[PDB]
């Protein structure tokens, strides 16, 4: 009857604040900053604050709903309650018919950086090892794919080599389009402490519009969309021009390559920009001489930079001067500005160069730090490998040796994991539209609302009668309402969980409460489904002839209830500890999966701690080796994978050196023209998360920001007969929405640029956006398209 408090990471942004959750009488009634979490040390943003309301939204789903018409499934039918048994019958039949008629390629899953590590792992096994389809792709394809491809190109291993502790040791902070004041508030406040308490510290904030992070900027810069590539190249030039190359670091630790150019925009091949492409979608590169490079960036003159970006010459020099100064510990930060960008991989590589020329990396207070938006985009989506090309621990389906390790460990026949790359996020949109993808299960995502260009591909595809759409969600979203089967899902602290944040910190949480009705977690869903299939129904005969001891076995027995996954008995759980899945299946399912999964990366640079260690700690940052977590990767002393006297080893590349890539500016896919005269950028707002399905179900979050507005410059409204408060129609070549004029909000765009958040389900901004992606990462450029306003 006293409140019970236990740790969990925050359900929201990638900062990964530690939280103490208070339960009483089967409800979460209180939630506070965990004092002893090193991330936030008790601090909290308004979203973390309202965590106890997110589960008690008004219309939680409690029951599977199928579209039905006199007693049977119908695409045009009315959502009607059916049992779990019946929901799996229909799913069983749908998957089994697709496998029969077009095979594994006609079946797909759309997963999430909001999945629990084990949910991600289970899903991958189901799809890759069970059904033999790589058509599993996440959330995170809209988000971190560009930073990930960037890491792989520059370092050969994923994820940052610094940590949040760099904040209170930095001399200078450069945010490359990150609105950290709103999207990483706990980081911001820590930066704010650093800045405000120390006069020799500088803060540069570059953005496409003025926002709340400008408040703390010594060097506040507004540039033109895409022009960051110019600035990035310019600073590199400046460093050379000013003899600021750290020679010693440069000599032992860097290679130079030139990247392939004129790569298109990851649109349908029929599209003008694809036909016009020279090297469409190529990530190819060749070794490059130093003077080749020096000539390359010499094109990027202070004068040209100023023109191409609209930013004052002296401000560009103040900025490049921070990188060049040999005594300035610098942190570089970026988020979707760099990542949701048609040359975002290039962006990523381009910013690394800056750090790599100057030797500013893998040291306390000093490093390039790719921020992550989602709570477990890193720990789940990226580390487990819930992508179409992926296997655990940075491994690729494309590599026969990688396939071998996984097939051997999982104890499935040789050759069962498929070698062909599956369909990425936007490609799944395109395949659905085409009737090529006929069975499609979405989990822990709101893609009808979050994915780009709704009208053109996704809505017609989802609604196509050749297709069967399944969504698992705690709430009836835009996505759920567009589906054919809705599966009611356990959320956050209604299950045992694990999330991995932006600084490689893995954080566990015990189950504290129980889901309403018959809501089950994604882990239950996936694992109970696996029992509906026999090996002979998913694997070809001559795969079975390699291990005939698996004939007549279900994907359940084969992927989840193996002696290995089930080593761990329920007696290991505390007597009064909730764990619906494990208590049902009679073994500690989360740990067995975790311990089989951790195996891949242990001893290969990705080391996860013993399962049970995370249940004690307020998280651990990997590699965790002999009890000891890693704060800085790739530097001697800090990382146990660097030998004595090496100084720096980037052991992700065969030869241990990081790679600088010379890459040009290329223009955004769609810029303003005569008709569509304004830039449109999109993103978030402090008080809302993503599509708002959770935060809008919080009375007071809704009351702080009830509707999406359109942030517009006074004179752009003036010139259009639009006044603050006016109803306004925003129109692109792809669709339209009706919003409200805001000339005096927190975001003040320069003239010519309009900005709009996507949380509001009545104002679907992704009816406007262009599904052009970085052709290398396949990440959609949500930040940049052309638009017009009518009254
Ligand atoms: N309150 C809140 N916080 C969140 C979330 C949320 O929903 N709500 N979601 C989380 C997730 S998953 C994500 S991915 C993040 C996103 O976090 P951010 O990327 O920080 O925020 P957004 O609102 O998505 O991005 C708008 C920013 O894009 C920049 N931008 C636009 N065009 C360009 C360009 O050409 N170049 C560059 N360099 N920058 C550009 C603008 O400067 C602006 O700063 O937020 C995370 N945290
Ligand atoms: N225009 C535009 N579009 C964008 C972006 C942008 O800046 N501009 N940002 C992109 C980025 S960075 C991201 S990360 C994506 C995010 O896009 P999404 O991840 O699709 O959006 P969310 O609202 O996070 O979706 C999470 C869903 O899961 C439900 N849910 C909560 N807990 C659980 C659970 O345990 N299980 C299940 N099954 N469901 C659960 C919530 O109700 C919610 O419907 O959006 C991308 N789309
Ligand atoms: S900063 Fe992020 S992790 Fe911390 S409380 Fe806010 S939303 Fe949650
Ligand atoms: Mo994101």
């Amino acid at each position: 009857e006293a409140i019970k408090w236990d740790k969990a990471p925050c359900r929201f942004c990638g900062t990964g604040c530690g939280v103490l959750v208070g339960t009483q009488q089967g409800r979460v009634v209180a939630c506070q900053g965990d004092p002893d979490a090193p991330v936030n040390r008790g601090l909290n943003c308004i979203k973390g604050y309202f965590l106890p309301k997110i589960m008690y939204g008004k219309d939680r789903l409690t029951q599977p709903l199928l579209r039905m018409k006199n007693g049977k499934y119908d695409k045009e039918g009315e959502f009607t309650p059916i049992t779990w048994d019946q929901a799996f019958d229909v799913m069983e039949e749908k998957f089994k018919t697709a496998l029969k008629e077009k095979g594994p390629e006609s079946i797909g899953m759309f997963g999430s950086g909001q999945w629990t590590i084990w949910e991600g792992y289970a899903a991958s096994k189901l799809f890759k090892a069970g059904f033999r389809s790589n058509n599993i792709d996440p959330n995170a394809r809209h988000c971190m794919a560009s930073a990930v491809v960037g890491f792989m190109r520059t370092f050969g291993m994923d994820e940052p080599m610094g940590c949040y502790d760099d904040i209170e040791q930095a001399d200078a902070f450069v945010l490359w389009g990150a609105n950290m004041a709103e999207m990483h508030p706990i980081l911001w406040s820590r930066i704010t402490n650093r800045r405000l308490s120390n006069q020799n510290v500088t803060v540069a904030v570059l953005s496409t519009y003025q926002h709340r992070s400008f408040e703390l900027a010594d060097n506040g810069i507004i540039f033109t969309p895409q022009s960051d590539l110019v600035i990035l190249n310019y600073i590199a030039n400046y460093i050379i021009q000013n003899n600021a190359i750290n020679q010693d670091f440069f000599s032992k630790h860097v290679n130079l390559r030139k990247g392939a150019t004129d790569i298109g925009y990851g649109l349908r091949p029929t599209h003008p920009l694809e036909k016009a492409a020279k090297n469409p979608g190529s990530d190819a590169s060749e070794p490059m001489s130093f003077e080749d490079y020096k000539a390359f960036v010499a094109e990027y003159t202070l004068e040209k930079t100023a023109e191409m970006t609209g930013v004052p010459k002296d401000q560009l020099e103040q900025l490049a001067q921070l990188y060049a100064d040999p005594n300035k510990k610098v942190i570089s930060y970026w988020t979707m500005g760099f990542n949701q960008h048609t040359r975002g991989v290039w962006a990523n590589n381009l910013v690394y160069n800056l750090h790599l020329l100057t030797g500013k990396i893998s040291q306390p207070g000093c490093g390039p730090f790719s921020l992550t938006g989602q709570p477990s985009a890193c720990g789940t989506a990226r580390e487990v490998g819930t992508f179409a090309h992926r296997l655990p621990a940075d491994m690729v389906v494309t590599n026969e040796k990688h396939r071998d390790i996984c097939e051997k460990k999982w104890n499935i026949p040789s050759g069962t994991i498929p070698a062909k790359i599956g369909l990425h996020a936007v490609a799944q949109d395109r395949a659905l539209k085409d009737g090529k993808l006929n069975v499609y299960w979405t989990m822990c995502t709101n893609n009808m609302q979050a994915g780009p260009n709704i009208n053109e591909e996704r809505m017609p595809g989802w609604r196509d009668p050749r297709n069967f759409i399944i969504v698992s969600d705690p709430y009836p979203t835009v996505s759920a309402l567009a589906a054919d089967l809705i599966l009611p899902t356990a959320m956050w602290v209604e299950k045992e969980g694990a999330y991995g944040n932006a600084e490689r910190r893995t954080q566990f949480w015990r189950q504290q409460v129980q889901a309403p009705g018959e809501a089950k977690s994604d882990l239950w869903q996936l694992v109970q489904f696996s029992r509906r299939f026999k090996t002979e129904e998913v694997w070809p005969e001559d795969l079975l002839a390699k291990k005939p001891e698996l004939r007549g076995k279900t994907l359940y027995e084969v992927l989840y209830a193996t002696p290995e996954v089930s080593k761990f008995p329920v007696s290991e759980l505390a007597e009064d500890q909730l764990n619906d899945e494990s208590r049902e299946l009679g073994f500690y399912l989360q740990k067995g999966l975790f311990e089989e999964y951790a195996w891949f990366g242990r001893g290969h640079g990705h080391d996860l701690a013993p399962f049970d260690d995370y249940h004690k700690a307020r998280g651990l940052r990997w590699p965790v080796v002999n009890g000891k977590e890693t704060q800085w990767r790739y530097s001697e002393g800090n990382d146990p994978y660097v030998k004595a006297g090496e100084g720096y080893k980037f052991y992700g590349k065969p030869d241990g050196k990081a790679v600088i890539f010379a890459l040009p500016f290329e223009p955004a896919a769609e810029a303003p023209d005569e008709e569509y005269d304004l830039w449109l950028s999109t993103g978030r707002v402090l008080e809302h998360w993503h599509t708002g399905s959770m935060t809008r179900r919080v009375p007071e979050l809704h009351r702080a920001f009830p509707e999406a507005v359109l942030f517009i410059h006074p004179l752009d409204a003036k010139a259009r007969d639009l006044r603050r408060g006016d109803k306004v129609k925003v129109v692109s070549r792809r669709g339209e929405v009706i919003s409200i004029v805001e000339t005096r909000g927190r975001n003040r765009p320069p003239q010519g640029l309009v900005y709009m958040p996507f949380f509001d389900a009545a104002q679907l901004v992704n009816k406007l956006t262009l599904d052009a992606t970085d052709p290398l990462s396949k990440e959609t450029d949500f930040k940049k398209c052309a638009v017009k306003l009518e009254k």
Side-chain angles (χ1 to χ4, degrees), residues 10-19 39-40 43-49 51 183-187 689:
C10 172
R11 175 58 178 82
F12 295 116
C13 95
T15 304
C17 294
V19 137
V39 168
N40 57 133
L43 294 194
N44 205 248
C45 75
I46 209 72
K47 281 180 314 298
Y49 185 87
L51 251 4
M183 325 306 177
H184 288 103
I186 262 68
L187 300 183
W689 175 261

Side-chain angles (χ1 to χ4, degrees), residues 38-242 244-338:
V39 168
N40 57 133
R41 98 208 258 91
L43 294 194
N44 205 248
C45 75
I46 209 72
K47 281 180 314 298
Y49 185 87
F50 283 122
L51 251 4
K53 302 193 174 285
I54 58 167
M55 297 181 155
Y56 309 119
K58 20 165 198 208
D59 48 352
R60 279 291 298 265
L61 279 344
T62 58
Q63 174 130 245
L65 314 176
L66 188 48
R67 280 184 202 266
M68 276 208 280
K69 228 186 211 190
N70 32 278
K72 53 182 289 179
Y73 166 73
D74 204 277
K75 233 306 204 287
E76 288 204 355
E78 291 296 298
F79 287 113
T80 149
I82 65 176
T83 75
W84 273 114
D85 280 330
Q86 284 161 332
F88 286 144
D89 299 336
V90 176
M91 288 168 88
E92 187 189 341
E93 188 271 284
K94 293 298 159 168
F95 277 68
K96 279 180 185 178
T97 295
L99 287 149
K100 208 226 191 113
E101 278 164 7
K102 321 198 185 162
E105 292 175 27
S106 70
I107 254 138
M109 169 144 83
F110 193 69
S112 180
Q114 285 167 79
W115 266 336
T116 250
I117 295 184
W118 21 94
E119 281 164 352
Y121 185 65
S124 185
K125 288 188 66 168
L126 216 219
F127 273 73
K128 295 164 195 273
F131 296 142
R132 313 187 80 232
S133 153
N134 284 319
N135 294 161
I136 185 168
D137 213 60
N139 242 350
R141 190 111 243 177
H142 292 142
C143 186
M144 303 307 293
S146 290
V148 173
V149 172
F151 278 112
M152 294 316 282
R153 282 154 70 80
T154 312
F155 299 98
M157 302 214 154
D158 202 6
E159 280 188 63
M161 67 296 293
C163 63
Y164 296 156
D165 306 25
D166 295 322
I167 297 171
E168 25 287 324
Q169 247 140 72
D171 304 319
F173 302 90
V174 174
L175 319 202
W176 280 98
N179 186 180
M180 285 181 88
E182 300 200 77
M183 325 306 177
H184 288 103
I186 262 68
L187 300 183
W188 196 235
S189 128
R190 282 173 74 160
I191 298 182
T192 301
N193 287 349
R194 175 47 167 176
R195 175 41 217 203
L196 254 20
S197 94
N198 202 290
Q199 44 189 287
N200 299 107
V201 156
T202 318
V203 185
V205 175
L206 312 76
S207 164
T208 254
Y209 53 100
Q210 195 191 309
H211 53 232
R212 281 186 185 171
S213 291
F214 273 79
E215 282 246 308
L216 193 95
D218 298 292
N219 195 173
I221 287 176
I222 285 89
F223 56 107
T224 203
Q226 289 278 318
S227 76
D228 42 6
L229 300 165
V230 197
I231 308 173
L232 285 164
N233 279 129
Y234 163 77
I235 298 174
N237 193 205
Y238 187 96
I239 300 155
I240 283 175
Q241 224 100 294
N242 283 286
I245 289 177
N246 173 326
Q247 288 312 322
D248 181 24
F249 184 92
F250 201 62
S251 262
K252 353 186 101 156
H253 307 127
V254 177
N255 295 142
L256 314 152
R257 290 200 151 250
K258 176 178 195 207
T261 58
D262 195 352
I263 70 189
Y265 296 85
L267 292 158
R268 291 187 105 116
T270 52
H271 188 283
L273 298 170
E274 293 314 310
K275 296 181 172 170
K278 166 163 176 177
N279 291 118
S282 79
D283 73 322
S285 71
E286 295 297 328
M288 181 185 224
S289 83
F290 179 69
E291 79 95 24
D292 270 343
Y293 179 67
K294 162 174 159 75
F296 185 102
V297 302
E299 289 299 285
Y300 297 98
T301 51
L302 177 69
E303 16 295 328
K304 200 169 77 161
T305 303
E307 144 153 50
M308 272 178 95
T309 64
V311 19
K313 232 115 84 172
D314 83 292
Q315 270 178 287
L316 297 159
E317 291 189 80
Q318 295 165 30
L319 191 245
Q321 178 42 33
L322 305 159
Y323 289 99
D325 177 335
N327 314 286
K328 277 220 157 79
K329 295 189 197 207
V330 178
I331 293 159
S332 302
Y333 284 127
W334 66 96
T335 317
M336 287 315 89
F338 265 15

Side-chain angles (χ1 to χ4, degrees), residues 348-612:
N348 270 257
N349 298 150
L350 284 174
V351 70
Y352 288 120
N353 298 347
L354 297 189
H355 280 82
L356 285 182
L357 285 168
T358 44
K360 293 190 185 174
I361 197 179
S362 303
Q363 291 317 334
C366 182
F369 194 101
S370 174
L371 289 155
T372 300
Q374 279 182 92
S376 203
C378 293
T380 301
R382 297 156 69 184
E383 288 155 33
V384 175
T386 68
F387 290 83
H389 68 302
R390 285 280 261 102
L391 288 165
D394 285 346
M395 284 174 116
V396 302
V397 294
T398 238
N399 189 312
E400 175 172 28
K401 230 155 237 145
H402 295 358
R403 268 194 266 102
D404 234 64
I405 291 164
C406 295
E407 278 161 11
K408 281 179 185 175
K409 223 258 176 283
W410 286 336
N411 191 225
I412 54 184
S414 180
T416 111
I417 285 175
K420 174 195 219 298
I421 282 167
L423 295 172
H424 61 87
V426 159
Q428 301 169 352
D429 279 344
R430 286 165 198 167
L432 258 354
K433 176 69 183 50
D434 292 352
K436 278 196 58 172
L437 219 196
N438 307 122
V439 193
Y440 194 51
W441 186 354
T442 237
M443 306 189 90
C444 210
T445 64
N446 202 182
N447 210 217
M448 198 39 85
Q449 183 170 179
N453 192 21
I454 305 167
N455 293 323
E456 289 209 355
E457 315 279 16
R458 179 166 336 100
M459 193 61 81
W462 278 41
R463 293 320 306 151
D464 186 298
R466 288 176 287 183
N467 295 344
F468 194 71
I469 323 295
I470 303 157
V471 345
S472 308
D473 204 291
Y475 298 103
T477 60
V478 172
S479 287
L481 301 172
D484 314 313
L485 176 53
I486 306 159
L487 301 175
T489 318
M491 80 191 278
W492 191 36
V493 98
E494 283 160 7
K495 60 178 132 179
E496 186 164 329
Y499 270 172
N501 80 177
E503 59 153 27
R504 294 171 274 102
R505 183 178 227 95
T506 312
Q507 288 173 92
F508 276 22
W509 73 92
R510 298 171 268 268
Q511 193 181 157
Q512 339 267 42
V513 298
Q514 267 169 342
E518 288 125 67
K520 314 301 223 168
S521 63
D522 317 53
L523 176 62
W524 186 91
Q525 290 181 227
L526 294 150
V527 176
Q528 298 295 6
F529 192 53
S530 63
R531 63 206 317 168
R532 300 299 195 99
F533 303 79
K534 294 274 191 193
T535 58
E536 300 89 8
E537 302 178 287
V538 293
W539 304 346
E541 172 58 32
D542 68 333
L543 274 179
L544 271 189
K546 298 180 182 165
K547 315 157 86 62
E549 89 274 353
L550 302 182
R551 289 168 188 292
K553 301 235 166 188
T554 66
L555 300 173
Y556 185 78
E557 300 177 86
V558 155
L559 318 166
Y560 314 117
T562 58
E564 274 298 273
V565 185
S566 64
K567 277 166 89 160
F568 306 115
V570 198
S571 57
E572 283 175 32
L573 305 163
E575 181 192 3
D576 57 304
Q577 185 187 1
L578 276 347
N579 194 137
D580 296 354
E581 307 88 336
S582 292
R583 291 210 180 281
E584 182 171 12
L585 302 165
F587 58 92
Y588 203 168
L589 182 66
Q590 294 92 342
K591 163 180 198 168
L593 283 185
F594 190 88
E595 282 291 308
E596 188 201 55
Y597 156 70
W599 185 86
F600 295 95
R602 279 147 183 194
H604 297 85
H606 295 272
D607 307 75
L608 292 163
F611 182 86
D612 304 297

